[PDB]
Design a protein around this ligand. Sequence first.
Ligand SMILES: [Mg+2]
Ligand SMILES: [Mg+2]
Ligand SMILES: [Mg+2]
Lengths: 132, 177, 215, 205, 110
Amino acid sequence: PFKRFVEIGRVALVNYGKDYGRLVVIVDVVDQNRALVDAPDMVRCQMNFKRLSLTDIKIDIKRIPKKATLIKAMEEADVKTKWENSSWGKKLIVQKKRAALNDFDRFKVMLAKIKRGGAIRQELAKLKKEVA
Amino acid sequence: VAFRFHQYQVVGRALPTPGDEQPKIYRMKLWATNEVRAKSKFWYFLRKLKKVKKSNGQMLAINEIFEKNPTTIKNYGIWLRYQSRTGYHNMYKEYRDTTLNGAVEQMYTEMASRHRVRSPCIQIIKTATVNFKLCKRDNTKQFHNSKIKFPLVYQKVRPPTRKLKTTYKATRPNLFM
Amino acid sequence: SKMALGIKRASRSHTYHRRGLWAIKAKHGGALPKAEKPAAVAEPKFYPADDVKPRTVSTRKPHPTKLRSTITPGTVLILLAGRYMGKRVVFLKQLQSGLLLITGPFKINGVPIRRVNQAYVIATSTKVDISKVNVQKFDDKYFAREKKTRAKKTEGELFESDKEATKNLPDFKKDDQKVIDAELIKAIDAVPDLKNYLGARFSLRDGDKPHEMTF
Amino acid sequence: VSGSGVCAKRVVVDARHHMLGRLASIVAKELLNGQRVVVVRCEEICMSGGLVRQKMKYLRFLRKRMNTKPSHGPIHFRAPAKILWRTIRGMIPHKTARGEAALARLKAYEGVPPPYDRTKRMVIPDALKVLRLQPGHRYCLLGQLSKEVGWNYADTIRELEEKRKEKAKVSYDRRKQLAKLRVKAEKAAEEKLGTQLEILAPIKY
Amino acid sequence: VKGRTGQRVRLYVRGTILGYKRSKSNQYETASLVQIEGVNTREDVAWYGGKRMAYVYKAKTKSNGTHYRCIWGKVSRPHGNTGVVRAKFTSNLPAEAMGKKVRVFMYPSS
RNA sequence: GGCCGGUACCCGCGCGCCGAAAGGCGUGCCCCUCGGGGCACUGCGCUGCAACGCCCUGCGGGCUCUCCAUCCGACCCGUC
RNA sequence: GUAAGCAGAACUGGCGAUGCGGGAUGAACCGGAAGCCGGGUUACGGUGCCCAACUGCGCGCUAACCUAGAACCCACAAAGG
RNA sequence: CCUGCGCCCGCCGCCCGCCCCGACCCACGUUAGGGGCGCUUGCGCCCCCAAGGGCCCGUGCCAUUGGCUAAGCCGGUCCG
Ligand SMILES: [Mg+2]
Ligand SMILES: [Mg+2]
Ligand SMILES: [Mg+2]
């Protein structure tokens, strides 16, 4: 049993190149290596499976569908929202946000996390001693 | 983006000669990497077919053809003449590609791989967008179906950019198709 | 537009406008004044054997060193060298000789108002409001050393006699620190956590890539 | 291959299912740059080419012996640790002082002899079998080769590894227990601190 | 680690000396090769281009009260596609220095 | 960002003022006509870029001398 | 001359008289000719380690149970299946 | 077995030499699969791409004078 296939509709992260991070809909297959990928911000183009990491979101669309219907199906399957709330899709967003922290923000994060460490230390001690 | 080949069309003619001061005009559709290489290949063909050499010839124009719809996949056919190690041969090759230019580059690489023929050896007789329901070749014709579906049997794991690349990674990678 | 500045400067008419030959057409009639034969010393005490050359008054007028774009009066900087490396300080203003003038404040960092080279500091994206601080009293002469005579060699007997005496930075610099420290703490407490922030020192803990780090 | 640049006092390498040549080139460059490696479970290295091809290669290596004094010529090792060590010596210039000081940093073991049991074993993605061979090509394990070449301690290493594996299974179940209790502790602190800890939410997952 | 003794702030990135700028049969001791810990690519060493480094070793005789020594240098230009840099020092390093640690500060910053 | 250079000529400074200073300030003619832009009358002179450090009989500085290590190179000369 | 790192000729260049970078090593093969130094960029040749440069981005072909195969000269292999 | 003027061992008062600058982190196993938690022990839920993560006063001139000190964390040391 396989849990993720290349088929018309499925959205994939683009996991390599100048264009890391973009989500693209596989609207057609060129051959066993290359695919047609389309996006709301980017014009349909060929792009290689080795540069595509498939995701778990699929959308019910035509073959090489018109741009309007591709958009309407993308919000019909709420791909950007579902990606963002996905743990995988949240991984990339959180790494960009951690990339965006400056020094004062990083110091506030350090202070916020030291108290959390002390808190979980206190709590773990109490609960371990509670469990007799 | 950048295409290793381009399809030009080149028009030339013999020099005017005070006998028949309007020579006949020859048009050809060439593939080459740039303008000067297209021109140099053009005089090749007119010298070996129309008995016209560049010194007694004249270049009228070189123009570069581009593809109508780069955003649509097209089944291409190339009838090509090549030189093996022991003679010449005629082949038909079908490709799928968004541009004839990319299909031709695909064909040069495929010929250089399947038959060890270099680009100086290949002559493209004819190129034609052979639409589906007429493709003769299994590898092309097997991709002609809606509801196509298959996994990635082969996918590289690699940092998205070079910056994330480390020699030591404590955890075995998780691969699953 | 460095090239456009160069052209506009190099134009003959604008060279006239800069060198101000007009208002030299004011004082000395409507024509440019003559020069004369100064320097009638006629009293050479000593004749050097080699061809004589006198001292230079440098007639060349160097451009002041430019400040970084990401430095504004009111930034928190990061020191890099010297005894205060890693200290997070406040940039008050660029003093006139070309060096940055910074404060700790001295109550929390122990870094006084001091002169630091622009090379050895890093801007941080943070700003403090220091509209209400008085700095005009600061200049180069405030820091001019007047180093004493080289006849004192620091020996063992002086090593801790200087430490156990207070013949050191005189009391008016002490007094100065109080006023700047107060007038800048009052505006540091407005920003949350900034007192702790400036109290801290910047360290590059494992897995920190400076080029990746914003500032 | 330029060198990891990690500052660890030693780097321990779990050489199970890696490729001999590529693991050894990576290690050799680590050693030359000056980083001390300790390659453990050397007996499990995968090698491309069939077991028969590696057998034939190693017996060609056996015929090579100095005629007039056999003890002097090639020294044909049998332990997987020593075969890997010889391979890396192949990539290091061992007739120079830099070369011998380079191999001095190399400690290779079969299995994981303590104190390397209680140590995270770093793997080298540039050489794993899964990522380096196409699934379907014949390969072999360096331990299975050496057994068939004249290393008489295969059973001993198997015994020691079965003991080590069960002894580590016990501890890993212990750390599952501790980890679920610490998960409970993390939420105990999370639902105890609210607005005081919002700042970590947009950079936590 | 916790309650440790040693330097309390690191304002310098570690690097390893890696050799010299060498052809297959020459060495050019004027410029050395350095790997900065954490840099992996040709663009990123463009940031360190200029930031001075220090080879800190320590001799056998005590001079100015310390065995420690310092030779000074800076990152001139990238050397290759994998974050190696060429380093220029005041006086050429010993050949024994290759493999040892070097401190790369951020003094000439921006 | 690297390497070199630091001025008798190209630059630059004074013969006016304001300005710590970068520098701003005049008049007349052409252009757009906003913003401002272009051009112009042109003279005497002078004309080796600076700031701050460290050490100064020191366990200092540096050496082309000696020994040793290390990387690279490197077969023993005369000769037919 | 059967062929020859063979003998005799033609045009040219090289070696001899010549270092230097590459071809692992080679007098004449490839690049190239040179005062002594700093900086940059290259030719030929390469970028897994030795060994400075990518286990870089693509596409195919090969599976060698014969030492699979891997550099102009070159250090060879054929007819045939 | 371990030198009757020789040495061994323990304590602490320290000087130095060397390393280092957070010199922190124990699953096995496969990758045409796997992981964690619950209960039909088979089915659910959630997750898997890289440690690219966790952890840690992480913040004091390798660190000013003092005083107190919850809980917690760490180092030494006794015992098991
Ligand atoms: Mg002769
Ligand atoms: Mg040169
Ligand atoms: Mg290398």
